[PDB]
Chain A
Amino acid sequence: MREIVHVQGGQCGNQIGAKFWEVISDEHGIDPTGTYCGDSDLQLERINVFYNEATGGRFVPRAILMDLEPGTMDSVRAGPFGQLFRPDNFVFGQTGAGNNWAKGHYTEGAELIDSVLDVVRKEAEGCDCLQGFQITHSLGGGTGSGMGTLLISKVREEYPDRIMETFSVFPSPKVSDTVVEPYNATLSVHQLVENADEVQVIDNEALYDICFRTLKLTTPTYGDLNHLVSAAMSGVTCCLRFPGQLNSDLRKLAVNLIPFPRLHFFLIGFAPLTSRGSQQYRALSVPELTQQMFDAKNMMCASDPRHGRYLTASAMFRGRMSTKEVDEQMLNVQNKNSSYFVEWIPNNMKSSVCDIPPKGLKMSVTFVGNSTAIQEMFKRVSDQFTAMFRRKAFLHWYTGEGMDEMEFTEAESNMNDLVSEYQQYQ
Chain B
Amino acid sequence: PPTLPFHGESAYRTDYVPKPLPEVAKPVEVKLPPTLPFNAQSCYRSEY
Instruction: Mark contacts of B19-48 with chain A using CB atoms, 8 A cut-off: 1 yes-contact digit, 0 otherwise.
Output: 000000001101011111010100000000
Q: Is B33 a contact of A356 with CB atoms below 8 Å?
A: no
Q: Which residue of A lies closest to B38 (CB)?
A: A42
A-B CB contact pairs (8 Å), 20 listed: A26-B30, A29-B32, A29-B35, A37-B32, A38-B32, A38-B34, A40-B35, A40-B38, A42-B38, A43-B35, A80-B27, A80-B28, A320-B40, A355-B38, A355-B40, A356-B38, A357-B36, A359-B33, A359-B35, A360-B33
- Residues of chain B with a CB closer than 8 A to A359's CB: 32-33, 35
Instruction: Mark contacts of A71-89 with chain B using CB atoms, 8 A cut-off: 1 yes-contact digit, 0 otherwise.
Output: 0000000001000000000
Instruction: Mark contacts of A49-89 with chain B using CB atoms, 8 A cut-off: 1 yes-contact digit, 0 otherwise.
Output: 00000000000000000000000000000001000000000
Q: Which 5 A-B pairs have the closest CB atoms?
A: A360-B33, A359-B33, A40-B35, A38-B35, A355-B40
- Residues of chain A with a CB closer than 8 A to B28's CB: 80
Q: How far is the CA of A38 from the CA of B32 in the complex (A)?
A: 10
Q: How far is the CA of A115 from the CA of B32 in the complex (A)?
A: 37
Q: Measuring CB to CB, which residues of chain B are less than 8 angstroms from any residue of chain A?
A: 27-28, 30, 32-36, 38, 40
Q: Apart from A37-B32, A43-B35, A359-B35, list 13 A-B contacts with CB within 8 A.
A: A26-B30, A26-B32, A29-B35, A40-B35, A80-B27, A320-B40, A355-B38, A355-B40, A356-B38, A357-B36, A359-B32, A359-B33, A360-B33
Q: Which residue of A lies closest to B32 (CB)?
A: A26
Q: Which residue of B lies closest to A38 (CB)?
A: B35
Q: How far is the CA of A304 from the CA of B17 in the complex (A)?
A: 54
- Residues of chain B with a CB closer than 8 A to A37's CB: 32
CB distance from B35 to the nearest CB of A (A): 5
Q: How far is the CA of A359 from the CA of B32 in the complex (A)?
A: 9
Q: How far is the CA of A357 from the CA of B37 in the complex (A)?
A: 11
Q: Measuring CB to CB, which residues of chain A are less than 8 angstroms from any residue of chain B?
A: 26, 29, 37-40, 42-43, 80, 320, 355-357, 359-360
Q: How far is the CA of A360 from the CA of B30 in the complex (A)?
A: 13
- Residues of chain A with a CB closer than 8 A to B35's CB: 29, 38-40, 43, 359
Q: How far is the CA of A80 from the CA of B27 in the complex (A)?
A: 7
- Residues of chain A with a CB closer than 8 A to B40's CB: 320, 355
- Residues of chain A with a CB closer than 8 A to B34's CB: 38
Q: How far is the CA of A38 from the CA of B34 in the complex (A)?
A: 7
- Residues of chain B with a CB closer than 8 A to A26's CB: 30, 32-33
Q: How far is the CA of A38 from the CA of B31 in the complex (A)?
A: 13
Q: How far is the CA of A10 from the CA of B30 in the complex (A)?
A: 27
Q: How far is the CA of A39 from the CA of B35 in the complex (A)?
A: 8
Q: How far is the CA of A28 from the CA of B28 in the complex (A)?
A: 19
Q: Which residue of B lies closest to A356 (CB)?
A: B38
Q: How far is the CA of A360 from the CA of B32 in the complex (A)?
A: 9
Q: How far is the CA of A356 from the CA of B40 in the complex (A)?
A: 10
Q: How far is the CA of A80 from the CA of B26 in the complex (A)?
A: 11
Q: How far is the CA of A29 from the CA of B27 in the complex (A)?
A: 19
Q: How far is the CA of A357 from the CA of B34 in the complex (A)?
A: 12
- Residues of chain B with a CB closer than 8 A to A40's CB: 35, 38
Q: How far is the CA of A156 from the CA of B34 in the complex (A)?
A: 40
Q: Which residue of A lies closest to B29 (CB)?
A: A80
Q: How far is the CA of A355 from the CA of B27 in the complex (A)?
A: 33
Q: How far is the CA of A29 from the CA of B32 in the complex (A)?
A: 8
**B32, B34, B35: which has the most chain A beta carbons within 10 Å?**
B35
Q: How far is the CA of A360 from the CA of B31 in the complex (A)?
A: 11
CB distance from A322 to the nearest CB of B (A): 12
CB distance from B45 to the nearest CB of A (A): 16
- Residues of chain B with a CB closer than 8 A to A39's CB: 35
CB distance from B20 to the nearest CB of A (A): 22
CB distance from B43 to the nearest CB of A (A): 12
- Residues of chain B with a CB closer than 8 A to A38's CB: 32, 34-35
Q: Which residue of B lies closest to A358 (CB)?
A: B33
Q: Which residue of B lies closest to A31 (CB)?
A: B32
- Residues of chain A with a CB closer than 8 A to B38's CB: 40, 42, 355-356
- Residues of chain B with a CB closer than 8 A to A355's CB: 38, 40
CB distance from B25 to the nearest CB of A (A): 13
CB distance from B26 to the nearest CB of A (A): 11
Q: How far is the CA of A40 from the CA of B37 in the complex (A)?
A: 8
Q: How far is the CA of A19 from the CA of B35 in the complex (A)?
A: 20
